[PDB]
């Protein structure tokens, strides 16, 4: 049950941040290609979807989407024409130019490894899987590729968002993108039903990664998330991480037996067991194999899931910050590693507040869209001090 049209109206002609996210998509306070040219997408209550949308400026933006009121509404990839002239129609035709890098973390591809909660619910104890998403994503953001100017966003619902504006960034192309993702996407099949067998040795960033994520993973997946007491379970998501035939028949035979072991004695067990089958001549390799199993296990639970193609597209459209969820009536705020789901302001709660204080600028969403302000200021004076930088490599 959606929060009724009149919230959703209300809640765009009083709260919604249009100045800041304009600001924030169009790099300057004077309307630009960046704004001008950029594709909207709407989605409304009852199912209809509208794209190739484009406002031209501040005012432009908030009365079409007043008029419209969208359950949501998702942004696109700056374009060579304005998206809302297609129809009327083909140069060649629409071509897409840059947009903003963008990385997304859905909590239901964890279903696997979390017991808490499945699907699109979420709490505070599974959420750490997505602040260790953001450590390992924001470390090779800032120390590999070296961006700077990013955001992480509640997505409403499942998880959580990162907007890369940088403007090398902006300008990578539908390979590049995919380069990108490689680089980050460590993990391949998803699986099971098989094993990583990630390369080796792991390259740098695995190696940064795995040592990030090590720390974490007794109380998260072994204590908090306990998934693999449930034998089926571990059966299914746990034994094909491992290399042997017979260390895995072993285990399975011995788990059917000794039933719903808890996940900490399932992991020990993995050790005892191989350590009585491979004592030997060759023991050293079979130990060295484990282990390697087990680092892959750590990523394969721990490690940054993306929602691939939505990285990977320059066109690909993805929902605005402050956005309300209708589903849940959750305001997708801006967000940091401290974030709690739970924490999320309800559009209902805002709306309550803003009488109860008579005033527009006195709710639990005013601090976000200050902090907001805060960071869209700064990455407006960088694009501006990139041009001035322009301007100092041709002082010369």
């Not at 571990?234 to 719903?260: E, G, H």
């Not at 087990?294 to 066109?315: C, G, H």
């Amino acid at each position: 049950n959606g929060p009724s049209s009149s919230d959703m109206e209300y809640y765009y002609k009083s709260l919604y941040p249009f100045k800041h996210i304009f600001n924030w998509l169009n790099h300057s306070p004077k309307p630009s290609r960046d704004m001008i040219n950029r594709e909207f997408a709407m989605a409304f209550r009852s199912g209809a979807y509208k794209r190739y949308n484009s406002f031209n400026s501040v005012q432009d933006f908030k009365a079409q989407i007043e008029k419209a009121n969208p359950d949501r509404f998702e942004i696109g990839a700056i374009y060579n024409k304005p998206p809302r002239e297609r129809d009327t129609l083909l140069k060649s035709e629409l071509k897409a130019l840059e947009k903003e890098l963008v990385f997304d973390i859905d909590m239901d591809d964890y279903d696997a490894f979390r017991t808490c909660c499945s699907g699109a619910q979420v709490c505070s104890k599974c959420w750490k899987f997505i602040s260790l998403a953001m450590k390992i994503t924001n470390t090779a953001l800032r120390e590999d590729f070296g961006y700077k100017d990013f955001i992480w966003v509640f997505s409403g619902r499942r998880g959580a968002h990162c907007w890369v504006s940088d403007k090398r960034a902006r300008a990578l192309t539908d390979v590049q993108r995919r380069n990108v993702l490689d680089y980050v996407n460590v993990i391949r099949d998803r699986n099971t039903d098989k094993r990583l067998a990630l390369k080796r040795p792991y390259h740098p960033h695995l190696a940064r990664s795995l040592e990030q994520l090590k720390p974490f993973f007794v109380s998260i997946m072994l204590e908090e998330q306990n998934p693999w007491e449930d034998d089926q379970h571990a059966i299914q998501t746990l034994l094909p991480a491992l290399y042997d035939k017979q260390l895995i028949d072993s285990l399975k035979k011995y788990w059917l037996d000794n039933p719903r072991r808890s996940s900490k004695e399932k992991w020990n067990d993995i050790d005892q067991i191989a350590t009585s089958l491979f004592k030997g001549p060759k023991q050293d390799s079979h130990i060295i194999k484990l282990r390697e199993c087990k680092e892959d296990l750590v990523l394969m639970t721990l490690y940054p899931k993306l929602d691939v193609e939505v990285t990977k597209q320059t066109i690909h459209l993805l929902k605005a910050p402050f956005c309300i969820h209708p589903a849940t009536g959750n305001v997708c705020v801006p967000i940091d590693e401290s974030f709690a789901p739970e924490k999320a302001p309800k559009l209902i709660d805002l709306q309550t507040e803003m009488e109860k204080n008579n005033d527009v600028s006195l709710t639990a969403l005013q601090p976000f869209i200050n902090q907001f302000q805060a960071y869209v200021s700064s990455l407006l004076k960088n694009e501006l001090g990139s041009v001035k930088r322009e301007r100092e490599d041709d002082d010369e």
